[PDB]
Amino acid sequence: NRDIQFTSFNGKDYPLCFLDEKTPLLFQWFERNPARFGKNDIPIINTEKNPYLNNIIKAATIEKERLIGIFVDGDFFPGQKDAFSKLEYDYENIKVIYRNDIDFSMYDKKLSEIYMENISKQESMPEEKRDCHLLQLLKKELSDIQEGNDSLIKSYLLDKGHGWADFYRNMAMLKAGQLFLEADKVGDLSTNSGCIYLDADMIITEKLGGIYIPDGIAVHVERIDGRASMENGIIAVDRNNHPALLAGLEIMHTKFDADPYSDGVCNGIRKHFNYSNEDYNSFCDFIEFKHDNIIMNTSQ
């Protein structure tokens, strides 16, 4: 509304920006084994203990005035893409966005460039503090680089773990509201380009309402027995190319084998706020996404 509000971390004040009740939601489904689903089924796991499509449909049915993205990748059968088109037709606020249809080149770097800056960073490293093996592996990987394969973004399309989904999610979230604009799925703003990423296990039990996040970014924090950690389930951004995620992308461009979750999000947010030596815990209550309307499918 009319007046900007502030919060303090480490004695510095920071602007709270306001994600209105129209801010889009983004879910993600990157599927290794489309063959597990019926040939004309929605290819998202939907079982009583894992009701992920139901969670997404619930969010869409609760937040009628929000766009609901499903950012998808994997070799889907053509009748599963047909199922996805039917979902968009059934629920007019659900918008399916294929990774394949989005250009991520503006966030790319040559593997050769990352490898060689790391070599130079080590080889020039004052003493033998050098990781002998990292130096050795870097020089060999620099050698086995195919012509149209010198891409940090293409490399994550061959990632064998969580890195395939988490790297692309970070870049989807660098695009934020502009993701819907890029996919021609808007029915938005040149300013109001915020977005809230939610993991498909999160359940909106009722209407989110307006949300205040600090300096335009907030993350899932989990607490177990009084210890807090930042988590990848919830990322809320004030706009596209939010500086914290660019900080995270900068680490992904410099640190060889950087983790897209702990470097691409956590470390990036950390650098943006210049944290480090203070309490992780006090930082975690600061950066935490406040909702109270998003439980997981493991609660009573």
Radius of gyration of the chain (CA): 20
Query: CB neighbours of 273 closer than 8 A, spacing ≥ 6?
Result: 9, 14, 215, 244, 283, 286, 287
Tally of CB atoms within 10 A around 45: 15
Tell me phi and psi for residue 110, to 5 degrees.
-70, 135
Tally of CB atoms within 10 A around 267: 21
Residue spans of the domains in the chain: they are 1-110+151-300, 111-150
d(CA 138, CA 166): 23
Long-range contact pairs involving 246-252 (C-beta distance under 8 Å, separation at least 24):
246/174, 247/271, 247/272, 248/170, 249/107, 249/170, 249/171, 249/174, 252/152, 252/167, 252/170
Instruction: Tell me if 73 sits within 8 A of 98, measured CB to CB.
Output: yes
Q: Which of 31, 128, 147, 231 is catalytic?
A: 231
Q: Is 88 a catalytic residue?
A: no
22: helix, coil or strand? coil
d(CA 238, CA 221): 18
**Per-residue tokens: 6:** 């502030």
Give the bridge partners for 229, in sequence order.
222
Q: How far apart are the first and last CA of the chain?
A: 35
d(CA 17, CA 65): 20
Tell me phi and psi for residue 259, to 5 degrees.
-80, 120
H or E element: which one contains 90?
helix 78-90
Tally of CB atoms within 10 A around 295: 15
**Per-residue tokens: 5:** 């509000």
Tell me phi and psi for residue 98, to 5 degrees.
-80, 130
**Per-residue tokens: 169:** 């999610």
Looking at residue 279, its amino acid is D
Instruction: Tell me if 264 sits within 8 A of 166, measured CB to CB.
Output: yes
Q: Give which of 257, 258, 230, 261 is closest to 245, Cα–Cα.
A: 261
**Per-residue tokens: 269:** 């947010």
d(CA 152, CA 141): 13
Instruction: Tell me if 235 sits within 8 A of 261, measured CB to CB.
Output: no
DSSP string, 143-203: HS--GGG--HHHHHTT-SSTHHHHHHHHHHHHHTTHHHHHTT-----SS---EEEE-TT-E
168 burial via Cβ count (<10 Å: 0-12, 13-18, 19+) = buried
Instruction: Tell me if 202 sits within 8 A of 184, measured CB to CB.
Output: no
Q: Give the resolution value in Å.
A: 2.2
d(CA 171, CA 234): 15
**Per-residue tokens: 1:** 């509304």
d(CA 243, CA 249): 9
d(CA 113, CA 253): 9
102 burial via Cβ count (<10 Å: 0-12, 13-18, 19+) = middle
**Per-residue tokens: 206:** 């009722």
H or E element: which one contains 273?
helix 268-273
Instruction: Tell me if 200 sits within 8 A of 55, measured CB to CB.
Output: yes
Sheet holding 68-73, edge to edge: 94-98, 68-73, 25-30, 195-198, 227-237, 217-224
Instruction: Tell me if 283 sits within 8 A of 273, measured CB to CB.
Output: yes
Query: CB neighbours of 156 closer than 8 A, spacing ≥ 6?
Result: 163, 164, 167, 168, 260
Tell me phi and psi for residue 223, to 5 degrees.
-120, 125
The sign one gets for the Cα dihedral 254, 257, 262, 265 is positive
Instruction: Tell me if 168 sits within 8 A of 99, measured CB to CB.
Output: yes
Instruction: Tell me if 201 sits within 8 A of 11, measured CB to CB.
Output: no
Question: Gap positions in the chain, given as the residue before each gap (C–N > 2.5 A)?
Answer: 187, 276
Long-range contact pairs involving 219-226 (C-beta distance under 8 Å, separation at least 24):
219/265, 219/266, 219/269, 219/287, 219/288, 219/289, 220/288, 220/289, 221/284, 221/285, 221/287, 221/288, 221/289, 223/284
Residue 37 DSSP symbol? S
Task: Please indicate the experimental technique that yielded this structure.
Answer: X-ray
Give whole-number Cα distances, 65 to 20, 91, 187, in Å: 11, 12, 11
Instruction: Tell me if 90 sits within 8 A of 78, measured CB to CB.
Output: no
**Per-residue tokens: 137:** 């592996």
